[PDB]
């Protein structure tokens, strides 16, 4: 006794603690259409929207469980066993149920999609590189922004605007014995001074550097990482910058 | 094991099927598995 | 032999290493009018624009030298000796040169201005409090923004968007042995994980807490600090929250 | 002192007149002044 496509989708979406919005961001599909598919207010969907939803879970799973080798195989095998479960739905309109035709068709649809995405990135390589990007947490879904507000390094190093903390661990002026209260700094006592910012930047610069791996050339390492060159060819080239 | 890997479904917050596909790796050899069973489940 | 008002303004503006833009932000006065006054493409200005420019230097000096008691007196006395120098310009149109009338008039113009500013703040107390503000560095000049992007605490604690570092101390995934390269994370290898962010937040929470002074009540401490209550009355009340 | 407090004008980046109004505090008593002369000029 099989469940309907809508029932199956809701089971998976919920079991991964994803909201309709969250999955609609991870996938091309609208909040409204997702919802309607799960109710049965929309019939069994197109094969292309099915592939889009799987691409949705694909992005998430890789965020959560990881792209690592031990999970890499588990993930590819999983997404396949779901793609079959969908086209074997009680209300399915797919009798070409030869899995290996669909599984291969999905991998050949995914690849086509990657290329489009990378072409669209290449156009805004400037703003991607300079971190002038608003990237929804968990997702590869992004929106270009006027400055790199979400770059922690930039926030600490920029001289354009005052940086604050919560209205808590404040009185960053230990000099609270100044007679008439600093003009309009009865509002902005949260402002970190230039000294503090550089001490915090150095703290983090150390912390990160005795883990991970410092990159000598930025322009270069990025430029080789983002292109239509073979995976196994460029991994060598990345290791060359990390170990000369 | 039995069906007492609802623990994985809840802490990793992954689907029932995926929690099985983890068990499926070195299945019955939970001893052999523990090296990987305690990897992303460790530094989490 | 006196210098013209324009010559005097440029001398002070430059001696404080302020740009026409910088001073035009600190003061109500436009970039264009400042420039024209310094050339003599504009005649001797109104008394009200003179007061505005001094208010400009006032804000800056307090940022640079400090509102502290030893400098508080130096600052008030300085701004006065400049207000006289301006109205004693070679091209000055002020023969009511009784300093104590102008000095008092300026202090009574400043006070009027403070009230207006605080009234205008009160309207947006919400966005000021929640740090949804873009405050030009050095200045009290601010612009309301949709989120508290410049609040360092919020950036580290929020779950809406990925946080980056410079394209340098990266490969935040030590797992660079994953076969086919993490989908579209050949672009976003700069993303700090949830673990790192909380370690950096705690680092800073410690660093700040073994200096400065933690504030128990935010709503309260802020609400009493921002109002038309006497300075000497509220200083007592602030010390009460810092020391019970 | 003399006119060799261009040093203050440059490091503090303050106006000639303000650099004098600093000297004016405990003026001639640069000894007495050093306690405040080395305050905002110290932790800078």
Residue numbers in the entry:
A (entry chain A), C (entry chain A): -1 to 242
B (entry chain E), D (entry chain E): 0 to 43
Task: Quote the original article.
Normally, these elements reside passively integrated in host bacterial chromosomes under the control of a master repressor protein, Stl (SaPI transcription leftward). Instead, SaPI activation depends on the formation of a complex between Stl and specific phage proteins, which act as inducers of the SaPI life cycle. Contrary to the classical phage and SaPI repressors, which are dimers, the SaPI1 repressor StlSaPI1 presents a unique tetrameric conformation never seen before. To derepress SaPI1, the phage-encoded protein Sri binds to and induces a conformational change in the DNA binding domains of StlSaPI1, preventing the binding of the repressor to its cognate StlSaPI1 sites.
Our previous structural analysis suggested the importance of residue L201 for tetramerization since their mutual interaction projecting from the middle of α8 nucleates the hydrophobic core. In support of this, a StlSaPI1 repressor carrying an L201E mutation (StlSaPI1 L201E), which introduces a charged residue into this hydrophobic environment, formed dimers in solution and confirmed the role of this helix in StlSaPI1 tetramerization. Furthermore, we solved the structure of the Sri-StlSaPI1 L201E complex, confirming both the dimerization state of the L201E mutant and its ability to interact with Sri, as our previous co-expression and SEC-MALS experiments suggested. The Sri-StlSaPI1 L201E structure was determined at 2.97 Å resolution by molecular replacement using the wt Sri-StlSaPI1 monomer structure that was previously determined as a model. The asymmetric unit of the crystal showed a monomer of StlSaPI1 L201E bound to a molecule of Sri. This complex formed a dimer with the symmetric molecules with identical organisation to that observed for the dimer formed by subunits A and B in the crystal asymmetric unit of the wt Sri-StlSaPI1 complex (RMSD of 1.2 Å for the superimposition of 489 Cα atoms of wt dimer with mutant crystallographic dimer), confirming the A–B subunit organization for the dimeric StlSaPI1. The Sri molecule binds to StlSaPI1 L201E in a disposition identical to that previously observed in the wt Sri-StlSaPI1 complex, indicating that the L201E mutation did not affect StlSaPI1 binding to Sri. However, although the Sri fold in both wt and mutant StlSaPI1 complexes is identical (RMSD of 1.5 Å for superimposition of 42 Cα atoms), the 7 C-terminal residues were not visible in the complex with the StlSaPI1 L201E mutant. Corroborating this, the Sri-StlSaPI1 L201E complex was unstable during the purification process and we observed Sri released from the complex during gel filtration chromatography. In contrast, the plasmid expressing the dimeric StlSaPI1 L201E repressor showed extremely high reporter expression even in the absence of prophage induction, confirming its inability to cause repression.
